[PDB]
Symmetry: D2
Subunit: 509 residues, 4 copies
């Protein structure tokens, strides 16, 4: 029987969720595609069902979204910001129940589910101010009697494909920014977090309807690769923001490139922490532990490589092991719990595949490496030593809590090992050395999109642009001038003079 029909989970009804939910919204709710059941990874119990989008559902939604864009693009940006402010408020009112659904359906611990909604709330309030700021410079033209202005305008329909592991915030970052930039949005979330997508869409849809705006401004078409592939090939999707694996993201980038679309890619990570000999080990150990095992190691910014200077390597590994053993495991909604399950059974199989591969490639499991004998998709957070920094399994992103630990001696080689992988998302050094810090930040430092000092690989806030380089895709979200990806630039020269161009010897009238 479904969890939503059990009294313990009656709070789901506060999100407007029922036994079977419509997975398409374009101003009206529907869903004529395949019905999907999503499961709680903490006990493998079914929660509720979502009717996904058919092709006809998708077609109607895209058409309705583009119609609504005619209205929405004419609303002054500060007024679009007001809507996004109200979206932030509607999220605040539901932050507890929504964060509980993230914990239930995705499986991260409750504070992180609530934290994910706080991120959406925060980006909305940031985007309110940005909505009075976006634009380009008025530049001095070299031409007398001419103006030169750089204009920014919405691209139109922004498709937003998101991953299971941040089922609210990632969409939130794209939605708040794309909306103030005058775009309509079409959301296709990960199938295994369909309820989260539906619940978020209901909160947003109420704000739009209360403001007598066409609901298709924030359209939703739940679906899998079928719908995702349509969006990547669809010329009507002016910007396709894809957050997901590098493997899938590469094909989406090619499909969008084929049709001269815009893509914003947020792909895989293989993030390293480097602890130098002068590092505060009382900061290194907890920073590494929490960055490696947080979210059961299923963050794009999870620390998956730990380089320790040889002088302190054994002590850090030993202190890390003694700390890992104190990780409190339980239901991700239960208090004091720090560690929940992997998102799917398949991830557990991939976890076990990686551990064996690390063993064959010469690595030693000094902690973990096994499934936990309990309901749900629980695996032990795992520490592997002795692999070469160039081991193939170390260069792969295994979206599971496995930390590969390496020795190093000198600064130049270990920056190179950080940069040698194909991923380019997050990175961190722990050190007190002022010259080393700025070398790390400089042209011979880390090649990642996020380059941190004395804070782990998940250190990131709304203020800055978030994203990676190389196989991480190159897109940026949230802060700085990331909004420019959601708009088109035009360089506009206006002749307001009476001057006529030189006749150049031709006799005009």
């Amino acid at each position: 029987t479904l969890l939503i029909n059990q009294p313990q989970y009656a709070w789901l009804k506060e999100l407007g969720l029922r036994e079977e939910n419509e997975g398409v919204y374009n101003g009206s709710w529907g869903g004529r595609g395949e019905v999907i059941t999503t499961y709680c990874p903490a006990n493998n119990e079914p929660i509720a069902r979502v009717r996904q989008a058919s092709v006809a559902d998708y077609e109607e939604t895209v058409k309705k979204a583009r119609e609504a864009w005619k209205i929405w693009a004419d609303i002054p940006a500060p007024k679009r910001g007001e809507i996004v402010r109200q979206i932030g408020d509607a999220l605040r009112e539901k932050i507890q129940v929504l964060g509980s659904l993230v914990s239930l359906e995705m499986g991260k611990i409750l504070v992180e589910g609530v934290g994910e909604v706080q991120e959406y709330v925060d980006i909305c309030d940031y985007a309110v101010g940005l909505s009075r700021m976006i634009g380009g410079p008025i530049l001095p033209s070299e031409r007398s009697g001419h103006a030169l202005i750089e204009q920014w305008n919405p691209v139109g329909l922004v498709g937003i494909i998101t991953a299971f592991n941040f089922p609210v915030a990632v969409y939130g970052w794209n939605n708040a920014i794309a909306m103030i930039c005058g775009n309509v949005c079409l959301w296709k979330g990960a199938p295994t977090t369909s309820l989260i997508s539906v619940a978020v869409t209901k909160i947003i849809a109420k704000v739009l309807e209360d403001n007598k705006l066409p609901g298709a401004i924030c359209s939703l078409t739940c679906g899998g690769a079928d719908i995702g592939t349509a969006m990547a090939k669809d010329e009507r999707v002016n910007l396709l923001s894809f957050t997901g694996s590098t493997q899938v993201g590469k094909q989406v980038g090619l499909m969008v490139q084929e049709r001269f679309g815009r893509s914003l890619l947020e792909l895989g990570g293989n993030n390293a922490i480097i602890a130098f000999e002068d590092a505060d080990l009382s900061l290194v150990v907890p920073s590494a532990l929490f960055a490696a095992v947080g979210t059961a190691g299923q963050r794009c910014t999870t620390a998956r490589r730990l380089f320790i200077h040889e002088s302190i390597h054994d002590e850090v590994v030993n202190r890390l092991k003694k700390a890992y053993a104190q990780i409190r495991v339980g239901n991700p909604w239960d208090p004091n719990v720090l560690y929940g399950p992997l998102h799917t059974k398949q991830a557990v199989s991939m976890f076990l595949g990686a551990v064996e591969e690390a063993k064959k490639e010469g690595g030693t499991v000094v902690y973990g490496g096994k499934v936990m004998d309990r309901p749900g998709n629980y695996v032990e957070p795992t520490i592997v030593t002795g692999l070469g920094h160039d081991a193939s399994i170390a260069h792969t992103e295994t979206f599971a809590p496995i930390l590969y630990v390496f020795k190093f001696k000198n600064e130049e080689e270990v920056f190179a090992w950080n940069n040698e992988v194909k991923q380019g998302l997050s990175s961190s050094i722990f050190t007190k050395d002022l010259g080393r810090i700025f070398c790390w930040l400089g042209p011979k430092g880390s090649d990642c999109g996020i380059v941190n000092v004395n804070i782990p690989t998940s250190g990131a806030e709304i203020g800055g642009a978030f994203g990676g380089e190389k196989h991480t895709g190159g897109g940026r979200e949230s802060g700085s001038d990331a909004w420019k990806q959601y708009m088109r630039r035009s360089t506009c020269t206006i002749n307001y003079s009476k001057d006529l161009p030189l006749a150049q010897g031709i006799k005009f009238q």
Copy 2:
């Protein structure tokens, strides 16, 4: 006999050119690939020869450039700016002969040959100032005792593939900007302007050598599709700036996307001028004439579609006819000449094919449409009326002076008509109406990268970013924050505090 061996053209030697020239420069000059002879399009006479790059040359040059980047990225940006200033001055010293070579080898008139070099001089001087400005904001972190900074660092090796029609300036825009941004450059020019590429490279090579810097910072590998494709597939080329046809540019963009490189695409145009009923006809006629037939219609920003309100359509056509007849044809280096030959004979075949196609699709040739009976690749500048705006040949970019004239009645439909094509480079309206002007600049206006008012489609200066949308590729060059395409952004969080992370109940030491 080669033009370089005739006393009449001995000025070529002031650029360091000889009978047979090395087309590979990486600090040394060489070239083991095919020897190409380029011809003067004004008389189809051979000028001189250039030995192109073989694969071994390309491999050697990329290795040397990437080594030199280690040196060049360590040079403080303002000092790189000093280098670019010296390059600008070196171009000043050769501006006359180099413009003559552009006129001789490419075929544009001398004033534009000189003007193209001046643009490079100008963009150098701009980059001198920019070299003290590039960077990102210090942002106020939400975390006490942390700094949040946005860093920009060079991408590394910037490959630069350029087209025949602006064989100095396009490279120049990419070189000056990529260089102050700390990148090394690898140039593959159009095969038919191989002498221009060698001449420019020699000018830069002396400046680098005088500053005791590795010449491979501005490397040259002359070649055709073979070398161009290698750059598009080469993981060592961090950014590939490609200027050329949409057809070729699309394949470059896919190859770069396939390997998760960066591309900067500057592809084709199909640029429209719209003359409204209130336009100043004394501005419309010369603006349209010079924009349509300039550079024999071989600018990416050439006016290829002219929309005129019905009330003034016949008068504007008649005045354009009276003006076209006065276009002075001759050798592009001859004094007072306004119109030279097409770049190749193949271009003439495309011209005649387009004219014949337009007549077959119902258009009327009211001026031109014929070859000129003289040496070189000379065709008559051509005006075509009576085609429907949706005619297939009107929607294709034929790189020749063919101006298709259409009637319109209303603002909305003609804005739709500007936007209905696949190209998205330049656009112009001519009008006095204030509200129309701002609609053109707004979200329901022109969808192009250059959006002009009372100035034709070639109105652009270095102060602003230059580039197009849709099938024009989305890249930007020169002004505004175009320099960011030449760098990688990192969002850097620095914990300078002694604060430790929350223990969350785990007992650390």
Copy 3:
């Protein structure tokens, strides 16, 4: 008897006002100075009393504010934004009653009273986003091994002196921006809007105290010329933002300059509307009326000079007269009322003095010019023709609804007449001419801080910096980078290298 003691006005109690109110807040409420009773200008009845600050109150408050700054400056800018966001919400909950108090005590109509509070709400929401954005660039140092960063830090204590006519918004702009910029504030409002200052401070005080923050971050010392002068002479007031008359503002500016403090001066206006022969008269006539008679002509941005091209002068005046006769007068809190009373009985006398002066200088009163025979400080909105543009009374700011009308012929002279006065606040032309518009916006155009086109002199929103030039004082508030006046810039060079400076022949160790 006091209005607050009559049941008709018991809503005053919803703002926490009582018969006698404390006019000092520094974390504690007090007031040992003079007790002032403020009056409703619509009926000359007393409203309630306020105990103003003694010298000892001011001394104690400044000390408490600077101690509070030590805590407040340590709060990360985004979290200060969160406090400001909450101030915005608290103002929302009180917007109706607070605007009603503005109408009651100051005398502007209700929609402008609520609009003034909405302005404070809007700038707060803006300041939330800005709080993640304020800062400077990281610049590329010319020195190898050096970083060059521009830092921004709070100035410390921002004193805020405000005028009667915007008793909420002006303070709001300064408070929201100063607060996220890490400053503490000291407010001295106009004595005749003391209840408004008390009421606003109570709303702010609750948010600060609810967040366990020292109340002195938003300190209040109600008082007149005494307290303002002390603030202007007090070295502990790092920035004094003064809004008021040019006469007082000039003395405030000199006192602050004497002590090498910072001032932000928002002084008097003498704002002109220019209607050209091509202007849309159906837009001009209402624009002038609402800008001239709005707030009974007591906005700093009120239209006080109307230049009409001679061809349309008689018609525009005739149409204005026909419209003026329909202006509805009444209690400013009554919904049909468009026109309320002048702020004081003295202001009424000044109205009469100016009118008599206009007649003495040769002007003709073609509409209005008299007090209205009703209770309160009601005067007829007045139109004066025939004065020379250089007439002494026309160059004076009379804070009353008197519109001086002038003929003009040429564009250059009427721009000159816009600029010939000492005030430099706001300016408007109404025209369709593209060249004239950009000339107006250009260096030979309007010399004012607000330069409007086809919208009157009160056209302004928070997105932009608000303020004037010349005797208007030069300060700026609200939008763009106006925040920089509330912070101090430092240009910071960090040598992180191991490099030692040249010995220059000296033997070091």
Copy 4:
């Protein structure tokens, strides 16, 4: 006999200098005021004469400058940059002889005179790029059918009063920036560097005349306090940039404030170097020596206070003593000299008063403190220990090479001691501590406009804005957005719509 009349000084003629030089330039050369003779401070020999400005000279020049502004304000900013580029080139051609004039007439060593001219050349090249960038944002209006633009226009006439100690660079910074910003300039240099002012003006005047531009764009009126005071009282001088003593600068600021002009104040410094126990002493000692005795201690950024941690105080003082003993004294034009004379005999007298006062206030002269018994104005570079950090003489700026040395123990008090003085120009700490460095850069760190780390107080480059806080005046020169002080901002709202304002119940026609 005049130095210029001796063959040994025939090089002065390369600057166009003669026996008696006209000290007024406004397109014509003149000078009816008093004839001043300037002397070489190394030997008190007269160099040549300058005819200073009478009042009538000044009056005619301001009028000619403002007339020239009408032409200059119409020239596109990029083209004004081209003028400044050419100024940069003309300075390049004369850098050696001009630098020799700086050493001869002002008295700093040859490398610094030449370096001073290089600084002017550099800011020109920078301003060339800036001239295509200056301007404001296009903002998203909250009003449908409205544009919101921030425009910047020249202020008009920029008066520039400069000090003796940087008689070329300071003017150059203001001139390069003021000119690209569309202002004309009126220069009054220090009387005792009049020949330098004329030599510079001659170089600029040639560039203007070769470009057929009115010479009054860069006017020169040589004179003393009288001409200086007239500029500060003159309503026609829209911005007065003043570089000089705090004493004089305070009166300049008050006079400018009195007439609601703009002032840009660059006043005195009392700059501290702080050495923490973890400092690289091999970096500290030379840094301290060169920053304290450079330019005979007559830089505004000269290190005048040295704070050393008690653990290392005696060692740093001893090592500094041993380094002072090796400072090479001689004629500033001798290439082996490091230390030349003070600028005037009065400076020597002030030096002696300071040394005596330091003794009277309890300090011990551990090195120097005496006049040198030799021709010219030579004093010994001086180190004073034992004074309390609050001794009055240490809080005074004595423009002489006197270094006051103090002990400190903790970080909080030494930051307070850096900040306790009235001056706020430059500041430096030497340390490796990451947290201490960012505290220094933060809100509880240095209160100065220049805040340096492991580089002395004279560390600044044109890329950043240069200037101080508190009694240093608050102005900024050169980099960042310093250009904005030379222009006026306008916030411009343009209604381009057909929309009419709500009638609010009035029946219009």
